[PDB]
Design a protein around this nucleic acid. Structure first.
Lengths: 142, 126, 59, 182
RNA sequence: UCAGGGUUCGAUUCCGGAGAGGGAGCCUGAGAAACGGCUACCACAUCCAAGGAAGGCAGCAGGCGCGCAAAUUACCCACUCCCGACCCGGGGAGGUAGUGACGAAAAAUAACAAUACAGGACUCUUUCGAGGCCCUGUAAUUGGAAUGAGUCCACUUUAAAUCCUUUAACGAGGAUCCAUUGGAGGGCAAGUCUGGUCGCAGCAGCCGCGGUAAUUCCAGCUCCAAUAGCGUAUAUUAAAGUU
């Protein structure tokens, strides 16, 4: 309520809504494309890179742990992304200066859990999954 | 076995000089018998003798019990021999093909294209 | 204690015992797996006074 | 070419109330999965949507007459509805279970020769029945009303006339090569 | 996708349009500013006896490169149509097969008796107890019965063949002719079981678990959900009367 309800006010409605839609956060990222330019991804679900070097990443309080991530440079941008490594002992199955395949966490822009500064994780080392390396139904191909 | 040949929608197709019907066949504990055997029985149901009869089709339904095809019967041989697509005549032999596979034609054609006046070498000779 | 640093990975998984008791018994699939599920829950017919039991109880 | 789905999934993933109904319904009729249940309920809820239109259309609109008349005939022809009803209001009184009575495996058990329902499904698949003259292998035949008085066993089977199976004739050859020559 | 009103997508089998490495010009013809025609410049790239000459796969296959990301240098004018001087010739148009868990439809992976315990209506008996009916799983072995999964002669299919349907002959005793993918603290269907670890290692969309008694970690057993499918990442709609 508190607004026009004319019969010839189609212009004053459809131009107002087209302006006040930009104050929404979601809409403003989709249509400016500043999302694409700023992201290390092109909007692609995955991406591929080459390892730079292992790191240890401290946890946010209350939790205290060391989380053993990696840091990676990409093939098609040359810029750098810091990527989590999953389950116990899977760090060892990643060896420095090889290729890897990365993927987002599942929150689509934001850092997940108690680990800060990480927005990406790792899925395949070299056409072989972290699962089959971990479980033992496959072996290192080298 | 004892089998039944049974008509279905006859036509006297005067323009092509033939008689075309459906070949509706019942088989009791068997089904799917040679097409050669079928045209024998149709020979001794219109007395036209089995070299001007031609049949094809014959897909058999589930569990057997029925099979249905499509048959022609020509008045004379020469009306079949003229009209008839070649492979149906060669189906029970009196014709063949050669010709010879495929390809050997096109690679010769493009070689014939690049000569003028005399192409008799390439037609025999490569 | 913790000795030989606590940054070490493979720690918990490389010092645990590994045991098994893999099946000889074949489990059912498709139809019959639903048949047993129907009978074992509803058509037995056991239920008694108000209880918390669940379909599992290894307590 | 042209393809479309014949079922839908429930909006809720879990719900104690729902799951028990779907389970106990599958138990009675011997169904393999919930996909065999939701299939039925898609068709039903589709028919419940079409009916829900025509009741709001003007009485004696030509669209309303021709549709309803030919619709109710089809519901009567499969026998999920009576002609002592024969109006659109009884479409909404129709429900899920009445369909399942007209399933092939249900009619084998209910009005023919079977043990438990779990047996009867196996007989349909192992080609020991027919519907009028025609072998079937589909327990989801849904059976027209007229064809209920032609459900018979098959004419080539060890159940009734026809050649025995390989368990019997095996043991017959155990009388000749298992204890007759071996 | 959706109650009503909408929102989002449309390279892509039909119709219209534009373009054949980038620009420009032009010949022929009824029709073209044509590229399976031509000429020139520009960017490329090939052969050469160095005098010269020849080229444009956003046609079908195929290769390199690019990337998260995508098939056979197969068979054939029989169908469907087109082109010609033509009933006869030609067509990578088009049809056929191969690869194919994009996706959709169909629905196997054990059914039935014997014994064995087990339950309750029913009957007898004061009750105990016994009989007995309807069924249930569950042990023990089995028994009888059935079938395609496969293997496979024949017929059929078709341009020739494959597949499918049809039919010989072999083909089920559960140990194998083997169903997996996730989960069990709450949201949310299912363990305050056993062993190991001790704020370490890890789990955790979210809330939170781990500091020696861990229902959440690593394993075992059991249980739950969906099922020939299930999980994960990302775009997007509904949920959002949070446009």
């Amino acid at each position: 309520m508190g607004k026009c309800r004319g019969l010839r006010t189609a212009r004053k409605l459809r131009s107002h809504r087209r302006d006040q839609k930009w104050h929404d956060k979601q809409y403003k990222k989709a249509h400016l494309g500043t999302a694409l330019k700023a992201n290390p991804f092109g909007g692609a679900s995955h991406a591929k890179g080459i390892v730079l070097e292992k790191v240890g990443v401290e946890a946010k309080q209350p939790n205290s742990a060391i989380r053993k991530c990696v840091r990676v440079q990409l093939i098609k941008n040359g810029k750098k992304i810091t990527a989590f490594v999953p389950n116990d002992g899977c760090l060892n199955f990643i060896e420095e200066n090889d290729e890897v395949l990365v993927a987002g966490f599942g929150r689509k822009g934001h850092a997940v859990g108690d680990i800060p500064g990480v927005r990406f994780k790792v899925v395949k080392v070299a056409n072989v999954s972290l699962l089959a390396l971990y479980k033992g139904k496959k072996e290192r191909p080298r | 076995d004892t089998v039944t040949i049974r008509t279905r929608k006859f036509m006297t197709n005067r323009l092509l000089q033939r008689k075309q019907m459906v070949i509706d066949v019942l088989h009791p504990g068997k089904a799917t018998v040679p097409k050669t055997e079928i045209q024998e029985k149709l020979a001794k149901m219109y007395k036209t003798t089995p070299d001007v009869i031609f049949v094809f089709g014959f897909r058999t339904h589930f569990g057997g019990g029925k099979t249905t095809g499509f048959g022609m019967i020509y008045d004379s041989l020469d009306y079949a021999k003229k009209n008839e697509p070649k492979h149906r005549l060669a189906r029970h032999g009196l014709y063949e093909k050669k010709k010879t596979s495929r390809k050997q034609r096109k690679e010769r054609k493009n070689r014939m294209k690049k000569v003028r006046g005399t192409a008799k070498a390439n037609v025999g000779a490569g | 204690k913790v000795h030989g640093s606590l940054a070490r990975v493979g720690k918990v998984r490389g010092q645990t015992l590994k045991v098994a008791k893999q099946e000889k018994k074949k489990k059912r699939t498709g139809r019959a797996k639903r048949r047993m599920q129907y009978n074992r829950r509803f058509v037995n017919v056991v239920p008694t006074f108000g209880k918390k039991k669940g379909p599992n109880a290894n307590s | 070419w042209v393809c479309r789905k014949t079922y839908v999934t429930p909006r809720r993933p879990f719900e104690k109330s729902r799951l028990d109904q779907e389970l106990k319904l599958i138990g009675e009729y011997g169904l393999r999965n919930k996909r065999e249940v939701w299939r039925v309920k898609f068709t039903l809820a589709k028919i419940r949507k079409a009916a829900r239109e025509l009741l709001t259309l003007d009485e004696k609109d030509p669209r309303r007459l021709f549709e309803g008349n030919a619709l109710l005939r089809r519901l009567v022809r499969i026998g999920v509805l009576d002609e002592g009803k024969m109006k659109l209001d009884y479409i909404l009184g129709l429900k899920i279970e009445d369909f399942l009575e007209r399933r092939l495996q249900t009619q084998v058990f209910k009005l023919g020769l079977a043990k438990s329902i779990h047996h009867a499904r196996v007989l349909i698949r192992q080609r020991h029945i027919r519907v009028r003259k025609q072998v079937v292998n589909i327990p989801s035949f849904i059976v027209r009303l007229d064809s209920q008085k032609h459900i018979d066993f098959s004419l080539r089977s060890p159940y009734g006339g026809g050649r025995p199976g390989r368990v019997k004739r095996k043991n017959a050859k155990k009388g000749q090569g298992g204890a007759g020559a071996g």
